[PDB]
Design a protein around this ligand. Structure first.
Ligand SMILES: N#Cc1ccc(N2CCCOCC2)cn1
Length: 460
């Protein structure tokens, strides 16, 4: 029975509004309703992995697991295995997988982050799950961010706290936050970004939604505009939105948006918004294709509609050779030529690099680079041909060309990372000097760039 080189992943996010679900929620897992929906001919085909994020979830873990498993069994006739479940307050993540994957999944991690301080600590934050699927690392974050149309900067701060403090994946990747630890990272939830139009325009917005004319609303969506100004979710992807705003509905219908201020809302307006979102980030040149992104029309217990997204995701096999794992394959090498980091820092410390990769026995520290002043007032750190030759554990090109090298540039004075990035080994050629590039980030914000050339030697 062969190992897969692709799997499909379902991501669901639903803010349940503290109400139990209706008796049937199969439309959610079938990707049926509005937006980019799944073909009817696929209805019996199970996804490999289902990841369900809830917010304002009033159920126990047992109660929700029973509903989810009974829903999937009715759709697929498969009894899914529980990989992980983790709950912070009323924010929950469930990961289910086909039973045939039980011995492909390992290194399961869960964590949460509580956002805010005093007044604003106690209900918002995030839960996460990570695991290995054969040779591929997968991370999943369900966040419930700060509410309210005039709190976009608080949401952005919540995002940065969650990616800094959520402790998932390989703890040996110490310089790297969750935005670099995984082959594929999915980040979803009630992100709570709103359509930023005047209150007076509420009925005009509703009109537009009834006409399925979303363009002048999406041009005011705070998550799209904050992402375009590089204020949040830098280097993440989102599918085009082609479904109506998923908040705020009158319960028990979808015919009415309830936007007006009420004592129950703190006298705040809730103009129709795309609160409920799925975003992803995958390593460079790894296959990831969104095959659905939409909302359900028939689940009406909450003031939010459920959102679905599904993905094709490339995966790799747990590679064994005669040599690695547990020795190097001296037929393999990675050389970095003429590399330099450009940093936005005002600091004048020396810097060194660390190279991290599951193709190495352990991470590799470089010598310090040579600092020069860039013309437009920046730091350029030159490494020359000084960088250590990296010795992968396996030289087979079928393995090595699928790997990635994480890079951290660290201060000699503090050993703190000033920037992190990732280089694919999926090269156009081996034994050939080729350009490489990554942006560098720290705490998820842009701090610089790393560029140079690579020369990869494989056994072929
Ligand atoms: N994705 C992923 C992944 C890979 C390894 C891992 N562990 C072993 C090394 C120490 O890190 C924490 C536990 C955890 N998660």
């Amino acid at each position: 029975q062969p190992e897969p080189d692709m799997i499909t992943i379902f991501i669901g996010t639903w803010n349940m509004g503290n109400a139990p679900p209706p008796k049937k929620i199969t439309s959610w897992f079938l990707s049926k309703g509005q937006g980019k929906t799944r073909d009817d001919s696929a209805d019996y085909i199970p996804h490999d992995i289902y990841v369900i994020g809830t917010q304002e979830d009033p159920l126990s873990e047992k109660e929700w697991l029973e509903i989810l498993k009974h829903s999937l069994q009715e759709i697929t006739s498969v009894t899914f295995k529980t990989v992980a479940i983790h709950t912070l307050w009323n924010i929950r993540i469930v990961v289910l997988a086909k039973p045939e994957h039980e011995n492909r999944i390992s290194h399961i991690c869960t964590d949460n982050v509580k956002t805010g301080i005093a007044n604003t600590l106690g209900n918002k934050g995030a839960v996460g799950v990570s695991f290995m699927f054969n040779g591929t690392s997968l991370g999943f974050v369900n966040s419930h961010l700060t509410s309210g149309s005039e709190k976009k900067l608080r949401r952005n701060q919540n995002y940065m706290n969650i990616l800094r403090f959520l402790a998932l994946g390989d703890k040996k990747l110490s310089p790297f936050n969750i935005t670099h630890r995984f082959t594929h990272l999915f980040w979803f939830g009630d992100l709570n970004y709103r359509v930023d139009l005047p209150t007076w325009e509420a009925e005009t917005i509703i009109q537009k939604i009834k006409q399925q004319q979303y363009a002048d609303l999406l041009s005011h969506d705070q998550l799209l505009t904050e992402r375009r100004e590089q204020k949040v979710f830098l280097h993440f992807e989102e599918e085009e939105i082609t479904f109506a705003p998923t908040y705020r509905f009158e319960r028990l219908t979808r015919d009415k948006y309830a936007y007006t201020k009420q004592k129950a809302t703190g006298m705040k307006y809730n103009l129709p918004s795309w609160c409920d979102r799925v975003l992803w980030k995958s390593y460079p040149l790894v296959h990831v294709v969104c095959q659905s992104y939409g909302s359900t029309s028939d689940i009406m217990t909450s003031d939010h509609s459920p959102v679905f997204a599904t993905f094709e995701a490339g995966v790799t096999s747990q590679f064994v050779s005669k040599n690695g794992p547990g020795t190097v394959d001296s037929q393999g090498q990675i050389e970095f030529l003429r590399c330099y980091a450009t940093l936005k820092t005002k600091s004048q410390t020396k810097f060194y690099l660390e190279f991290h990769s599951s193709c190495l026995e352990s991470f590799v520290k470089s010598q310090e680079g040579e600092n020069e002043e860039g013309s437009e007032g920046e730091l350029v750190v030159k490494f020359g041909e000084t960088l250590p030759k990296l010795k992968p554990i396996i030289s087979d090109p079928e393995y090595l060309l699928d790997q990635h090298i994480l890079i951290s540039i660290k201060s000699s004075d503090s050993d703190e990372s000033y920037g992190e990035g990732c280089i694919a080994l999926r090269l156009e050629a081996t034994e050939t000097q080729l350009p490489i590039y990554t942006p560098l980030t720290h705490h998820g914000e842009l701090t610089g760039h790393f560029q140079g050339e690579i020369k990869l030697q494989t056994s072929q």
